[PDB]
Design a protein around this ligand. Structure first.
Ligand SMILES: Nc1nc2c(ncn2[C@@H]2O[C@H](COP(=O)(O)OP(=O)(O)O)[C@@H](O)[C@H]2O)c(=O)[nH]1
Ligand code: ALF
Ligand SMILES: [Mg+2]
Lengths: 318, 136
């Protein structure tokens, strides 16, 4: 039997990353040639990540640990406009590695919530040397961590537990959502992604809007839609790993002023969980399941998707 | 007359994204691809940009004005996916419309296609066949 699955969620919530894990778990993963096609995407994120941090230094008026680094910054900005997109020359990675070790750069990096920085900034930057080592070949995690804004609607198909999954991945930015209506017919189940770590961030579309509030408005509109009352709705509270770390330094009261619980993964995590589940108008008849997930973690995803698959399988024989 | 690309030509559309988009048949074949992934508004915006910079400079204020209405405006019919930074810079220059006003917006949508859409194109059947129907 066939099953139409929908991956919905705001921009940068983890959707495509899930797709990547489905490929790794139910599609024989990547080949060497494919793995290598990500090197440029990785060098691209890396650069864009260090560039944003650098620019934030002046925007947030933070000063370098060592004044010398100022030139390195200027020369990086230049090489950014002259080299070939998606490459990383020795003289460039040398400049990036020196900025990274700067105490002021780190201070700005720690304030990533104050501007727009890729989730994987610290992942790549921390290990740039490994990435530019001759003979470098991306690791699964390196691929999983790669960032590419997706536009449109893309289908990927795989079989599992004797079910033919037709999984549809969409774009999350506001302009892409008007295209979702084209897939609402015959939806067997919707996996809705929510970035747990978005509570102190603002949208790329509107830096005045909090990312989680945006996410809450979106989910509210989706779970309450005539086209899904007979569709399985699973909530993926994603980026647990990033969330359990910033919740130790950044108070959830930034998103919810009324929150009085402790700022710890467990309590704040459940508070966010509740605010989303309580958006359902008919939870009376239709229940919404939810898992704390880390889309970049294959084991967690393989586990959670197995559970999602059971839900589907069970809601079907009724 | 019809335009039937040769083996080489079709083959070099996979050398780099610009090669595929600088070719009329490339774009045309690329459009059939985006239409399937519901992201054809990006290639339309790109062209529109070209037609503004390299078109009759007599009606720039006219074109940009309607480009904003078709691709940039909130809820616009061919609404494109650009960030807020890139969107403000643009709405700013549209107060004094000129040829290279959509630069920022265009460079953005260019890379959007290049990193996401393009990649999947060279893998699609719509390309394998284009290549199979290659001359000599
Ligand atoms: N550490 C970490 N990164 C994640 C998780 N999920 C997505 N990411 C990263 O966040 C960025 C955005 O994810 P992506 O799949 O493109 O999101 P979507 O397509 O907007 O839903 C990518 O660089 C991913 O590697 C996560 O659970 N943990
Ligand atoms: F929602 Al996205 F890339 F931002 F898939
Ligand atoms: Mg995506």
């Amino acid at each position: 039997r066939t099953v139409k699955l929908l991956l919905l969620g705001a921009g940068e919530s983890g959707k495509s990353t899930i797709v990547k894990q489905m490929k790794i778990i139910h599609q024989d993963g990547y080949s060497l040639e494919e793995c290598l096609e990500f090197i440029a995407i990785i060098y691209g994120n890396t650069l864009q990540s260090i560039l944003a941090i650098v620019r934030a230094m002046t925007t947030l008026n933070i000063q370098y640990g060592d004044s010398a680094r100022q030139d390195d910054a200027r020369k990086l900005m230049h090489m950014a406009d002259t080299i070939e997109e998606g490459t990383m020359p020795k003289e460039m990675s040398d400049i990036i590695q020196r900025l990274w070790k700067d105490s002021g750069i780190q201070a700005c990096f720690d304030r990533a919530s104050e501007y727009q920085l890729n989730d994987s900034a610290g992942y790549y930057l921390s290990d740039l040397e490994r990435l530019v080592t001759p003979g470098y070949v991306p690791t699964e995690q390196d691929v999983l961590r790669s960032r590419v804004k997706t536009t449109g609607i893309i289908e990927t198909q795989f079989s599992f537990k004797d079910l033919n999954f037709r999984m549809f991945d969409v774009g999350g930015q506001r302009s892409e959502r008007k295209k979702w209506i084209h897939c609402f017919e015959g939806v067997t189940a919707i996996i809705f992604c929510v970035a747990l770590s978005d509570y102190d961030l603002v949208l790329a579309e509107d830096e005045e809007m909090n990312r989680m509030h945006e996410s809450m408005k979106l989910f509210d509109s989706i779970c309450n839609n005539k086209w899904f009352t007979d569709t399985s709705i699973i909530l993926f509270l994603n980026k647990k790993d990033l969330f359990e770390e910033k919740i130790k330094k950044s108070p959830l009261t930034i998103c919810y002023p009324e929150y009085a619980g402790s700022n710890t993964y467990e309590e704040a995590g459940n508070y966010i969980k509740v605010q989303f589940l309580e958006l359902n108008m008919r939870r009376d008849v239709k229940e919404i399941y939810s898992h704390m997930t880390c889309a970049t973690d294959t084991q967690n995803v393989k586990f959670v998707f197995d559970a999602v698959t059971d839900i589907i399988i069970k809601e079907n024989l009724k | 007359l019809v335009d039937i690309p040769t083996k080489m030509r079709v083959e070099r559309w996979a050398f780099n994204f610009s090669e595929l988009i600088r070719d009329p048949k490339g774009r045309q074949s690329f459009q059939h691809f985006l239409r399937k992934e519901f992201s054809g508004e990006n290639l339309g915006f790109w062209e529109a940009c070209e037609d503004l910079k390299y078109g009759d400079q007599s009606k720039v204020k006219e074109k940009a004005e309607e480009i904003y209405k078709l691709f940039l405006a909130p809820g616009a019919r061919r609404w494109i996916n650009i960030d807020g930074k890139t969107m403000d810079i643009t709405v700013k220059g549209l107060k004094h419309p000129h040829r290279y006003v959509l630069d920022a917006a265009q460079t953005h949508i260019y890379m959007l296609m290049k990193k996401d859409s393009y990649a999947r194109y060279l893998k699609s059947p719509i390309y394998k066949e284009m290549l199979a129907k290659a001359i000599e």
